[PDB]
Amino acid sequence: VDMGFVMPVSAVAQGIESGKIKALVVIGEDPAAYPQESALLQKLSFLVVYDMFMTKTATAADMVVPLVSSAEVNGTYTRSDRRIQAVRAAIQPKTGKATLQILIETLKSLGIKYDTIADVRAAIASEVSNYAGMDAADFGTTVYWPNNKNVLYTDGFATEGQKAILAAVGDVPVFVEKKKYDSVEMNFVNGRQSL
Amino acid sequence: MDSMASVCGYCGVGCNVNIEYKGDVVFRVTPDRVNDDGWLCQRGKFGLGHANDKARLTAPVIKRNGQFVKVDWNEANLEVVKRLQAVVAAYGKDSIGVVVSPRLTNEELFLAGKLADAVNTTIKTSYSVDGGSGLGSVLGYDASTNSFAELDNSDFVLTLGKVKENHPVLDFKIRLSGVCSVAWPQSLANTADMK
Amino acid sequence: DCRPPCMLACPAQTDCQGYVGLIANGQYEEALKLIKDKMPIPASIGKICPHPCETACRRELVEEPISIAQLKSFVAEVDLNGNQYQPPMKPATGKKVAVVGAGPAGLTAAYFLARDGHKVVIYEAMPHPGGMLRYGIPQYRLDKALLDAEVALMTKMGIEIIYNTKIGDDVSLDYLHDNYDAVFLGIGSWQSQGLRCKGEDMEGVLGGIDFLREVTMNSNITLGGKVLVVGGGNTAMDVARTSKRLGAEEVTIIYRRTIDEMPAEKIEIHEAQEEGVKFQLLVAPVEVLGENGHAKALKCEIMRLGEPDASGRRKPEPTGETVVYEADRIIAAIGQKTVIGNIKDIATDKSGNIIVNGGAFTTNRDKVFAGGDAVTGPKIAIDAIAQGKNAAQVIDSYLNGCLVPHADSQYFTQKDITAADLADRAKAPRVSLTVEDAEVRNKSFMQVAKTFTEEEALRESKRCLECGCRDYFECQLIKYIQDYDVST
Amino acid sequence: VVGAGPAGLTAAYFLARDGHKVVIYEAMPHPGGMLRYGIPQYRLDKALLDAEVALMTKMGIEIIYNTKIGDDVSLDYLHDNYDAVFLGIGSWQSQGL
Numbered sequence: 001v002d003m004g005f006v007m008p009v010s011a012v013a014q015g016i017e018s019g020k021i022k023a024l025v026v027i028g029e030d031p032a033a034y035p036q037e038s039a040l041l042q043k044l045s046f047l048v049v050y051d052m053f054m055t056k057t058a059t060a061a062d063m064v065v066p067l068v069s070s071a072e073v074n075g076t077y078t079r080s081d082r083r084i085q086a087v088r089a090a091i092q093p094k095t096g097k098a099t100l101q102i103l104i105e106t107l108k109s110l111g112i113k114y115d116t117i118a119d120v121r122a123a124i125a126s127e128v129s130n131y132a133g134m135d136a137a138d139f140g141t142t143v144y145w146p147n148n149k150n151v152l153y154t155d156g157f158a159t160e161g162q163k164a165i166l167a168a169v170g171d172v173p174v175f176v177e178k179k180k181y182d183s184v185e186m187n188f189v190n191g192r193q194s195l
Numbered sequence: 196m197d198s199m200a201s202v203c204g205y206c207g208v209g210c211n212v213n214i215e216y217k218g219d220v221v222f223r224v225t226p227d228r229v230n231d232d233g234w235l236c237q238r239g240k241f242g243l244g245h246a247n248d249k250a251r252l253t254a255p256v257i258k259r260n261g262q263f264v265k266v267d268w269n270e271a272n273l274e275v276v277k278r279l280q281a282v283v284a285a286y287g288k289d290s291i292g293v294v295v296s297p298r299l300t301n302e303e304l305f306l307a308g309k310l311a312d313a314v315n316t317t318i319k320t321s322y323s324v325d326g327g328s329g330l331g332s333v334l335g336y337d338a339s340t341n342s343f344a345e346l347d348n349s350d351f352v353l354t355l356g357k358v359k360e361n362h363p364v365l366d367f368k369i370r371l372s373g374v375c376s377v378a379w380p381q382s383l384a385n386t387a388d389m390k
Numbered sequence: 391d392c393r394p395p396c397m398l399a400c401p402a403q404t405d406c407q408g409y410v411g412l413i414a415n416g417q418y419e420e421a422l423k424l425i426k427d428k429m430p431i432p433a434s435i436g437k438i439c440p441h442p443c444e445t446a447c448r449r450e451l452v453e454e455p456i457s458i459a460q461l462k463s464f465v466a467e468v469d470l471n472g473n474q475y476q477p478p479m480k481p482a483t484g485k486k487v488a489v490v491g492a493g494p495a496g497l498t499a500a501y502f503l504a505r506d507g508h509k510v511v512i513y514e515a516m517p518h519p520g521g522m523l524r525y526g527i528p529q530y531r532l533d534k535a536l537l538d539a540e541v542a543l544m545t546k547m548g549i550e551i552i553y554n555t556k557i558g559d560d561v562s563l564d565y566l567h568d569n570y571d572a573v574f575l576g577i578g579s580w581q582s583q584g585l586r587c588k589g590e591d592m593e594g595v596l597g598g599i600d601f602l603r604e605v606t607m608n609s610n611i612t613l614g615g616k617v618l619v620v621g622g623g624n625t626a627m628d629v630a631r632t633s634k635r636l637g638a639e640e641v642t643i644i645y646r647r648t649i650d651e652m653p654a655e656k657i658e659i660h661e662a663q664e665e666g667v668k669f670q671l672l673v674a675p676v677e678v679l680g681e682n683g684h685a686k687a688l689k690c691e692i693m694r695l696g697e698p699d700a701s702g703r704r705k706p707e708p709t710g711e712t713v714v715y716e717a718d719r720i721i722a723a724i725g726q727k728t729v730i731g732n733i734k735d736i737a738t739d740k741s742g743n744i745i746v747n748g749g750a751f752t753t754n755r756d757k758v759f760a761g762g763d764a765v766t767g768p769k770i771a772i773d774a775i776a777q778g779k780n781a782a783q784v785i786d787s788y789l790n791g792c793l794v795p796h797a798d799s800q801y802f803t804q805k806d807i808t809a810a811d812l813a814d815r816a817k818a819p820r821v822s823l824t825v826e827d828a829e830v831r832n833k834s835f836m837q838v839a840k841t842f843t844e845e846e847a848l849r850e851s852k853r854c855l856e857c858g859c860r861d862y863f864e865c866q867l868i869k870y871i872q873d874y875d876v877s878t
Numbered sequence: 879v880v881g882a883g884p885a886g887l888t889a890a891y892f893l894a895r896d897g898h899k900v901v902i903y904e905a906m907p908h909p910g911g912m913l914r915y916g917i918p919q920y921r922l923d924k925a926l927l928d929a930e931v932a933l934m935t936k937m938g939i940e941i942i943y944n945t946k947i948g949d950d951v952s953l954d955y956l957h958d959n960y961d962a963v964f965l966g967i968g969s970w971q972s973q974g975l
């Protein structure tokens with residue numbers, strides 16, 4: 001959410017079916033397990049899948065690039081309560097290159113120069129608004145992204161006019177259960193049934 | 196067994212874990228009793244077993260004549276960059292959508308955003324995130340206004356949804372805290388009752 | 391024959407018979423040691439050269455000639471994958487030479503000057519070295535990783551290359567004149583000729599060189615459905631096939647003379663025809679039609695075949711018939727022209743090329759030398775390599791206090807050899823090149839041809855006729871003929 | 879840093895003391911500025927200044943002499959190739975009568 005991946009999926013579906021979107025890049029997801037999304041993906045022109053397994057989506061792609069698991073990656077995860085926790089790699093990447101390395105070489109080809117994870121963290125600190133201070137954050141301790149504060153809106157809300165926006169909501173039916181799209185989650189669910 | 200301190204990669208509670216491994220094989224996962232409360236759920240405890248799977252991919256493959264051909268990393272990088280550039284050239288701006296999974300670290304998500312910026316597109320999305328929780332339009336930030344560490348001192352906790360079934364370590368913490376927790380009734384599924 | 395026809399036809403005078411025979415004896419390292427006496431980048435040159443040496447091979451009098459360029463590329467790649475060769479250098483003399491531009495001429499001059507003990511610095515105006523071999527030759531013909539590896543090997547010899555530095559705009563030439571003992575200008579020709587017609591400034595019309603450079607730097611380009619390429623040289627072919635690989639559904643090439651009079655290589659034309667670019671023939675530009683600043687049509691006249699010129703190609707004659715062609719992009723690839731830029735106090739001719747004293751490579755300004763496409767205009771890469779090597783030799787002689795011009799040598803040659811003189815030789819088919827099918831070529835940028843294997847290289851190299859004299863390196867008659875200036 | 883006068887030398891010293899990499903472009907064959915070409919020898923010994931500048935150079939600061947910005951190297955070159963530029967050119971024009 002904090003890096004801007006907040007566009008709704010219905011826009012992607014409409015842009016696929018309106019002919020405006022011609023290529024898709026899927027990183028770690030499996031939308032093709034469901035028939036309607038598979039039919040939508042079949043109307044593409046070029047599809048890349050980054051995934052650990054040869055899943056249903058990667059079979060129908062034009063190019064598949066392997067990924068490493070959470071035991072082989074160095075980085076950070078942002079908790080639900082805005083806490084940034086370090087993720088440390090236990091074993092060396094069994095495919096040869098980490099995901100960060102793959103993205104770094106691709107951006108190197110496209111003309112953006114990064115060397116290691118320190119440069120990426122400095123860029124995150126200097127470009128993402130609320131992660132200012134990630135460069136010397138020392139993720140071995142408690143780090144929260146809004147000015148290292150546990151509580152939000154202590155001095156007013158963060159809207160345009162510093163006021164809460166109240167809008168009327170209509171009638172709402174019964175909740176519709178969400179689906180699982182991450183390949184690791186569905187893999188765990190299917191592997192539960194093996195025993 | 197050698198031990199490495201990481202965090203769980205399955206939901207947003209983000210429990211700290213110790214991965215116990217010997218060489219290139221992960222053998223077990225234990226809770227981190229020093230830096231956290233030391234609780235885990237089934238997904239955190241028994242979920243890293245995909246790191247030892249033999250069906251994981253090892254090298255990138257490019258489709259020719261309907262069959263996947265193993266290629267080097269440099270050839271894969273060239274192919275994906277040139278095909279993306281060809282799509283951009285043939286169909287102009289906003290023809291490429293970048294679908295990611297929320298399991299990636301902060302640096303990989305930032306680099307995927309940089310790649311989306313560099314290929315002249317604004318369509319960055321996720322099927323899991325699917326537009327956020329809707330709290331952003333009201334208060335400005337799509338984030339929790341309080342941390343988990345403040346569940347100990349509250350005198351009343353109202354739970355909406357299946358908090359126990361989906362994020363059970365949070366339920367363990369709430370039960371051990373002893374505060375008065377009241378669940379929203381199930382027979383109130385429409386928002387007219389919220390009105 | 392003091393030297394074989396194949397070596398004499400090569401612009402750089404590379405000893406083709408020597409290293410072909412050394413391949414036939416299984417000595418690949420010695421073959422590369424022979425090749426690297428004339429150029430520092432043998433794999434790329436073998437990959438892209440139009441091989442004038444192969445035309446003059448006497449094996450043509452029996453069957454197809456020896457695939458000399460493929461053998462050169464095979465040996466260069468075998469040494470690059472194995473133990474990289476570094477030729478010996480003389481002890482340092484303390485002289486400083488600055489080379490402007492990292493193209494084939496600049497790279498060759500720096501190589502052969504650093505091999506004489508001098509300290510050479512290359513100033514390059516682009517982020518990567520190679521010149522038009524990098525920003526003009528497409529990836530599917532010349533792999534850029536090969537060129538990068540070769541330039542890294544050259545840099546390991548002690549040559550400093552400074553990128554993103556343009557002479558005249560960022561560093562003045564007076565700075566190099568004051569701070570160095572010699573300067574060699576290998577700037578090359580980097581300006582695209584216009585359509586030379588009415589409405590050539592309309593938006594939607596772009597040069598071939600700039601389009602190819604934008605393709606190489608992985609920038610954001612716009613092509614659309616229909617692309618019209620104007621021109622008939624190698625630039626038109628490369629632009630057409632690059633646009634075919636870049637998602638254009640149809641590409642049209644427009645020229646004024648016959649297929650038989652195209653200046654491009656026949657192999658490249660046939661490959662382009664197989665890939666899917668349609669040729670539109672006997673047509674010259676008339677008027678560019680566009681609306682609201684956007685060009686969508688190209689108006690042209692239809693010509694007819696006429697008398698051959700002095701260069702052996704039939705002249706076009708107008709017919710008075712007009713035809714308009716729909717397009718989404720129009721690319722002008724008529725040719726390249728030399729631009730001097732902001733460098734001042736350098737004399738230039740009527741066509742823009744640098745004027746030099748013939749045989750000594752000296753401009754009007756003292757301590758400043760020139761060569762390559764900056765002098766000869768647009769030509770093939772081996773010509774630039776030869777000019778760079780000769781200018782490096784001349785600069786090295788000039789640094790010693792006595793300037794000596796470059797002069798050619800006299801050899802005995804035989805011109806009465808016919809097929810009836812080679813009726814006793816056995817016939818062996820030439821080694822075919824394995825070319826990837828037209829399915830994968832149209833969509834990808836990967837290589838279209840594979841390098842020779844060891845067995846194929848031995849089979850091809852064991853087919854030479856050994857036309858040269860075996861006693862040349864110890865014959866005394868030719869020694870005295872060269873020494874006493876006697877014409878042969 | 880453009881110019882090796884007291885201002886340029888001090889800026890380079892206190893920037894190299896903070897971990898950055900500093901390059902000094904000087905338009906004269908020797909460093910010092912008006913302390914060298916304006917102060918006479920009988921008041922300031924030039925060997926003393928040369929020894930101090932050598933001490934500063936031992937810290938890892940590269941000084942490029944005979945390079946005039948604007949005439950030999952454009953300022954756009956320094957703008958493109960460096961993270962900061964400090965102009966310490968000083969006043970070097972004589973007033974007329």
Ligand SMILES: Cc1cc2nc3c(=O)[nH]c(=O)nc-3n(C[C@H](O)[C@H](O)[C@H](O)COP(=O)(O)OP(=O)(O)OC[C@H]3O[C@@H](n4cnc5c(N)ncnc54)[C@H](O)[C@@H]3O)c2cc1C
Pocket residue numbers: 438439440490491492493494495496513514515516519520521522523525526527555556557558576577578579580624625626628629731761762763764768769770771772774
């Ligand atoms: C479409 C196309 C097809 C070709 N096909 C072939 C082929 O089939 N066979 C073949 O052998 N060759 C081919 N060539 C290459 C060409 O024929 C020669 O290789 C050319 O002579 C390159 O040599 P050069 O000395 O001109 O180097 P250049 O490529 O001209 O090198 C000049 C270098 O100097 C740099 N420079 C320019 N101005 C300045 C300045 N002011 N200050 C500093 N640096 C500067 C340039 O950026 C470049 O790096 C092709 C080229 C093109 C564009």
Ligand code: SF4
Pocket residue numbers: 203204205206207208209210234235236237238239240362363364365
């Ligand atoms: S509750 Fe379970 S799945 Fe969620 S973070 Fe904790 S261990 Fe992982």
Ligand code: SF4
Pocket residue numbers: 399400401402404406435436439440441442443444458459462772
């Ligand atoms: S550079 Fe060209 S002419 Fe010279 S030997 Fe090689 S292929 Fe023949």
Ligand code: SF4
Pocket residue numbers: 394395396397406407410446447448449455456854855856857858
């Ligand atoms: S047969 Fe051999 S020696 Fe004779 S021209 Fe051909 S390559 Fe040269």
